[PDB]
């Protein structure tokens, strides 16, 4: 909500992404793939070379990805909060219907002959 | 034209290895490849898998349906009811239009 803010303060009333979040694991896997591609384009032993460099690729991807997921989760909470508050404010636009059973509702039968 | 290698000659695996199984040039790898294909393909998947399929527990409950139908036929004929009614759903629960 707050102008030009990545994580408005109201977002702290939401639970943070777990560090075992499957999306965070995928992001970390992307960091690992980036490390391997880095070795490959420089003709270094792909798996073994420069493990410190590979570690930083994983850690930096996870670090940024954690805050993106935190903001992603927040923005969908805001979408739900806005939509339900609007439904409360305009009941006549969202009437609760009378539900009829299939014994009462007429549906045409189309034979497959 | 250009500088290009000529097409290499054809290699018959039987000249070097008369006992070739056709998997690998290396006779030891060639034997192992045949072993895994036959053991895992024929001995495991086809033999055990066929046994598994044969003893599937009532696949799609066709055997329960036959047992259930016998129970219904016995009950309905004893009590004088029709074996099967044209109506699937009780018409007291239906409200026709018009």
């Amino acid at each position: 909500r707050a102008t030009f803010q990545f994580l408005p303060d109201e977002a702290r009333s939401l639970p943070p992404p777990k560090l075992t979040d499957p999306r965070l694991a995928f992001v970390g896997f992307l960091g690992y793939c980036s490390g391997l591609i880095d070795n490959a384009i420089r003709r270094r032993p792909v798996l073994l070379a420069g493990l410190h460099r590979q570690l930083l690729y994983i850690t930096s991807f996870v670090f940024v990805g954690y805050y993106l997921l935190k903001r992603q989760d927040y923005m969908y909470a805001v979408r739900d909060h806005d939509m339900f508050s609007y439904i409360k404010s305009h009941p006549e636009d969202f009437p609760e219907k009378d539900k009829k059973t299939y014994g009462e509702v007429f549906e045409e039968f189309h034979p497959v002959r | 034209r250009w500088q290009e290698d000529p097409e290499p000659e054809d290699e018959n695996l039987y000249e070097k290895n008369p006992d070739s199984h056709g998997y690998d040039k290396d006779p030891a790898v060639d034997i192992w490849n045949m072993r895994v294909v036959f053991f895992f393909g024929f001995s495991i998947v086809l033999v055990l898998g066929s046994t598994f399929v044969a003893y599937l527990p009532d696949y799609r409950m066709q055997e329960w349906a036959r047992r259930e139908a016998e129970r219904l036929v016995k009950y309905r004929e004893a009590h004088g009811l029709p074996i099967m009614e044209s109506n699937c759903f009780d018409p007291s629960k239906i409200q026709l239009p018009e």
Binding site: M83, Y86, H90, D93 | -
Partner: protein, 63 residues
């Protein structure tokens, strides 16, 4: 898996998919109304901020 577990797992799956489907329909109708009437948080296009106005007495009176 026994039929009961699969059967009741299916009802759990059906409930979530039915709840999501209803929300998707609600979102499309909420978006339609908010855009047409401008009365909601979405499609709130900015107007000039009124804190920019200066209300001090001016060089001349009629303003």
């Amino acid at each position: 898996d026994g039929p009961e577990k699969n059967y009741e797992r299916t009802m759990a799956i059906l409930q979530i998919e039915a709840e999501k489907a209803e929300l998707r329909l609600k979102e499309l109708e909420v978006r339609r109304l908010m855009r047409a009437r401008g009365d909601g948080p979405w499609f709130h296009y900015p107007t000039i901020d009124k804190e920019l106005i200066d209300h001090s007495p001016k060089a001349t009176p009629d303003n």
